[PDB]
Design a protein around this ligand. Sequence first.
Ligand SMILES: [Mg+2]
Ligand SMILES: [Mg+2]
Ligand SMILES: [Mg+2]
Ligand SMILES: [Mg+2]
Ligand SMILES: [Mg+2]
Ligand SMILES: [Mg+2]
Ligand SMILES: [Mg+2]
Ligand SMILES: [Mg+2]
Ligand SMILES: [Mg+2]
Ligand SMILES: [Mg+2]
Ligand SMILES: [Mg+2]
Ligand SMILES: [Mg+2]
Ligand SMILES: [Mg+2]
Ligand SMILES: [Mg+2]
Ligand SMILES: [Mg+2]
Ligand SMILES: [Mg+2]
Ligand SMILES: [Mg+2]
Ligand SMILES: [Mg+2]
Ligand SMILES: [Mg+2]
Ligand SMILES: [Mg+2]
Ligand SMILES: [Mg+2]
Ligand SMILES: [Mg+2]
Ligand SMILES: [Mg+2]
Ligand SMILES: [Mg+2]
Ligand SMILES: [Mg+2]
Ligand SMILES: [Mg+2]
Ligand SMILES: [Mg+2]
Ligand SMILES: [Mg+2]
Ligand SMILES: [Mg+2]
Ligand SMILES: [Mg+2]
Ligand SMILES: [Mg+2]
Ligand SMILES: [Mg+2]
Ligand SMILES: [Mg+2]
Ligand SMILES: [Mg+2]
Ligand SMILES: [Mg+2]
Ligand SMILES: [Mg+2]
Ligand SMILES: [Mg+2]
Lengths: 98, 68, 223, 42, 99
Amino acid sequence: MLIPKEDRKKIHQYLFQEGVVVAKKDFNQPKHDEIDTRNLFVIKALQSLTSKGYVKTQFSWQYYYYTLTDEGVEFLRTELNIPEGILPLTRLKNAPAE
Amino acid sequence: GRVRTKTVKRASKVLIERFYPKLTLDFETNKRLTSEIAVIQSKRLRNKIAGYTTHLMKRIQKGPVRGI
Amino acid sequence: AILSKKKKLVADGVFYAELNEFFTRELAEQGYAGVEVRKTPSKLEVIVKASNTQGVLGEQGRRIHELTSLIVKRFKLSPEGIAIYAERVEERGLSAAVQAEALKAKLLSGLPIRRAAYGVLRFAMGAGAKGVEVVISGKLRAARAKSQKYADGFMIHSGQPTRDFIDIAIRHVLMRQGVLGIKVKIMKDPAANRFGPRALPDAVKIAEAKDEDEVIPAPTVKS
Amino acid sequence: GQSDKRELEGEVEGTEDAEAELEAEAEENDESLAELELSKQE
Amino acid sequence: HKIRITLTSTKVKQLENVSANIIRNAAQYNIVKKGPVRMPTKVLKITTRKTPNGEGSKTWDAYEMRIHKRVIDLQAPASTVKRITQITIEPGVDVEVTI
RNA sequence: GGCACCACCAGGAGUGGAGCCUGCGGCUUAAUUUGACUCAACACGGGGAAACUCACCAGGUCCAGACACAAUAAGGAUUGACAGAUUGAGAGCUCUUUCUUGAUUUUGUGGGUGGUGGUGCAUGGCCGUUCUUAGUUGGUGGAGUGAUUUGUCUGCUUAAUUGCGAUAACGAACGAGACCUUAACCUACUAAAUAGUGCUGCUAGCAUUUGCUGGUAUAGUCACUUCUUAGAGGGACUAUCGAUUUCAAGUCGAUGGAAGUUUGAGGCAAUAACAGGUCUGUGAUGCCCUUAGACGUUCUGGGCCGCACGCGCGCUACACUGACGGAGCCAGCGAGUAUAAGCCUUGGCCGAGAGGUCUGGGAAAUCUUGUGAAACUCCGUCGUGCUGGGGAUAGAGCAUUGUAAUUGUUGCUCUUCAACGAGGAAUUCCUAGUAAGCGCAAGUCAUCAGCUUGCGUUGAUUACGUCCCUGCCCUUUGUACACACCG
Ligand SMILES: [Mg+2]
Ligand SMILES: [Mg+2]
Ligand SMILES: [Mg+2]
Ligand SMILES: [Mg+2]
Ligand SMILES: [Mg+2]
Ligand SMILES: [Mg+2]
Ligand SMILES: [Mg+2]
Ligand SMILES: [Mg+2]
Ligand SMILES: [Mg+2]
Ligand SMILES: [Mg+2]
Ligand SMILES: [Mg+2]
Ligand SMILES: [Mg+2]
Ligand SMILES: [Mg+2]
Ligand SMILES: [Mg+2]
Ligand SMILES: [Mg+2]
Ligand SMILES: [Mg+2]
Ligand SMILES: [Mg+2]
Ligand SMILES: [Mg+2]
Ligand SMILES: [Mg+2]
Ligand SMILES: [Mg+2]
Ligand SMILES: [Mg+2]
Ligand SMILES: [Mg+2]
Ligand SMILES: [Mg+2]
Ligand SMILES: [Mg+2]
Ligand SMILES: [Mg+2]
Ligand SMILES: [Mg+2]
Ligand SMILES: [Mg+2]
Ligand SMILES: [Mg+2]
Ligand SMILES: [Mg+2]
Ligand SMILES: [Mg+2]
Ligand SMILES: [Mg+2]
Ligand SMILES: [Mg+2]
Ligand SMILES: [Mg+2]
Ligand SMILES: [Mg+2]
Ligand SMILES: [Mg+2]
Ligand SMILES: [Mg+2]
Ligand SMILES: [Mg+2]
């Protein structure tokens, strides 16, 4: 897929920092509401990450539920060049409730 | 047709073998009596059972009936 | 936006149908049983019932945290507006949803049907169910497909009580040779029902004779 | 189990899985913000 | 104030428990009340074909969705009425309060 | 032997005959996509297709071919592109043309992925059918060496293997019945300014007798729950009395009753089963096929409507128990929106109409709406005539929806006014608010309902019986069948 380098980035600082992403299955939608790029880019960008075991993909009712594996956080540590500067948001260990 | 079933025929004649002195020849009285005698889940079945017990009671006074 | 009473309650139901199916595909491996949508002020409590509450609230409750965020982002919910809780199934043997996935997880492990099938027949009865019947349909190392019923105990089939004392679960089993369809029909004991009727409609419980006392001719006991 | 075995075995073997699992599970019952770093770019 | 509370749900027992409990709470509290007023229940009917394909006798399902709506008028200040709503929260029945 | 208006009897309405609507076959076609072939294919796939849908046809784009490699590659792997040509196209699709972007990416290998592509004769699920007929099963006991059998039956009765009864059986379970939903009753409870009423304020018209019809009334800060709504209950159990019967199960009459055909109607519905239908509902599926000149996807245009013909579900009619023309004027089931992508739409004003326009109400027991519907009723014209029945076919014109109406989407106006004069052999549905008419709403829906799903208005004739036809169920019987006669 031909994604601009900058738009591929924005997809990565949303799939990191809230490491789960939801995208409706419509390829021609101009903007996925929460990542300022084409909606089709979000589906195909994370399809590559799920192809190399960096995101789980779930499909239900024409919607994609992408979640970032713990194995994928280390890779974005090295590509976004981030340091181990805290947890995305879903790993901040807010702990469950009883 | 108006043929009563087995859940009402055997249930009606068990009432007679155990509670005959308290029973009667009145359907209205029997219907009220059976609400404290049997635990019947539905009102229509209570009336159905009491309606057949009264018929059997009305028949016993004319002689002994078979199965009770 | 502005939505009618008729169109809102149907939408609330549709929200329930889509959310529940999301958990069935995602939490299939954790014996997902059902979901309860408890509306409340300033929060939307949702109780998910699963056989295994370790697969959900695992590794510092990460999955449940990473799972509640996927629902706020798809339904445009405020991050504080929803709270998700994970609850253990009380009677694992009486929940057909857990039993069908577990059976699926055994069939998918290559286990023979009888050791697997009798594993749900006896597990249902062991939990105290009045009856249980399992139908397994599909193809197994043979081109022609077959179905087998495994009954046990007492089962009712017709009328409303089937809507009260029977829960059902259908699961498609993806095998290398085709699809296996399993139906796990479990009839709970109506005596254990705690809100609706506690017995079948034709169950008549006649009381016992309280008589055979001795009556003495005619005194009166004063005080 | 269309063989004379595995419904004989399948039956006795099915029961040891559940009977062992009610008790095992009955044992289970007895114990009844990252963009902050990018704001440091200020 | 004159405050109206509108009650809608699919199942009537829990709606009616909340309806009776609020009037009860509007009884020990000396609050004049009007209700509950039973709106004509709405039968949401959907009639589909049974067959996923188009073969067989043409047999139809007829699904239903009962919607019951009750409005109760209470004449009390808004602070008093609102705390009754959280005391009588029930999952099935939703509550909207309009002045 | 028995049951059944998907059987008949007594009958009603019809269909088959006509025109037209629609589906199927055939023929034609560039394609006229396809599934289905007795009941249980043929107004069925919710299939009322202008584009989309769409799978067919003539052409044109795109990769939305992830990922591990290898090659190429900054001295640039590659992407977009004005203008002209080209093209159906203001598709940089491609060609002249040098600009731009920058390792996302181009080529080969593997590997994918997507398919309304094939296979329902590989499958899940669902659905139809046998069949909603009345059937199915074990415990103990009896018979048999056994598989098995009895229980599960001569008779009567019922809608029913449902009951009486007879009984080597006794006592039970599923199915049936119970159950649930709906319709009919409640001046007996609970209330209602989103329901209705009487009084009362204020107010109109007509005769003056103080009366009769209205309007107004969300402050008259009223009263009430009969009508209306809906929750808690009650009520029918064939109640009582006569007949018949093994005096049993029951059946038939009356009386009372709101209801006495299981009170009417439905929902659910056993044990197995069919090579029944669906991979064209599914990001349900195995395998096979294709995968860059795609069978993926998208754009433009056409087709699914194509017409010597056969058949099926239907709509109009053949007139006077009627057509028109005025007038009267009554339901019930339901649905309804926001920065949309536009809902139901009153009221006013234009317009012969169809329709247009300006305002307002309603996310609704509040407004559309009393949906003032149509048959129907009254008064007239018509006068047995292919006539004022019937309204095809077609010409010319006016609007609406839609990017787009040509092969007329639909509506309206004038004109044209065809077969049809009650339909052969055959054949369908039906027993009471039922049949038949008569419309209305919801679904499809930007637009189009001769279709379905329901609803109410008017409202019958004739049985309430039978095994004569047709289909199914049971018993006995024969069997060389058990993949079970498609043997
Ligand atoms: Mg039953
Ligand atoms: Mg039933
Ligand atoms: Mg289900
Ligand atoms: Mg018979
Ligand atoms: Mg007979
Ligand atoms: Mg006979
Ligand atoms: Mg038939
Ligand atoms: Mg016939
Ligand atoms: Mg006849
Ligand atoms: Mg006709
Ligand atoms: Mg053809
Ligand atoms: Mg054709
Ligand atoms: Mg096209
Ligand atoms: Mg295609
Ligand atoms: Mg088949
Ligand atoms: Mg029948
Ligand atoms: Mg024996
Ligand atoms: Mg037998
Ligand atoms: Mg018998
Ligand atoms: Mg009343
Ligand atoms: Mg069924
Ligand atoms: Mg067939
Ligand atoms: Mg399918
Ligand atoms: Mg067609
Ligand atoms: Mg038809
Ligand atoms: Mg007229
Ligand atoms: Mg009305
Ligand atoms: Mg003429
Ligand atoms: Mg005419
Ligand atoms: Mg129109
Ligand atoms: Mg319509
Ligand atoms: Mg149609
Ligand atoms: Mg008859
Ligand atoms: Mg008869
Ligand atoms: Mg015959
Ligand atoms: Mg012979
Ligand atoms: Mg043989």
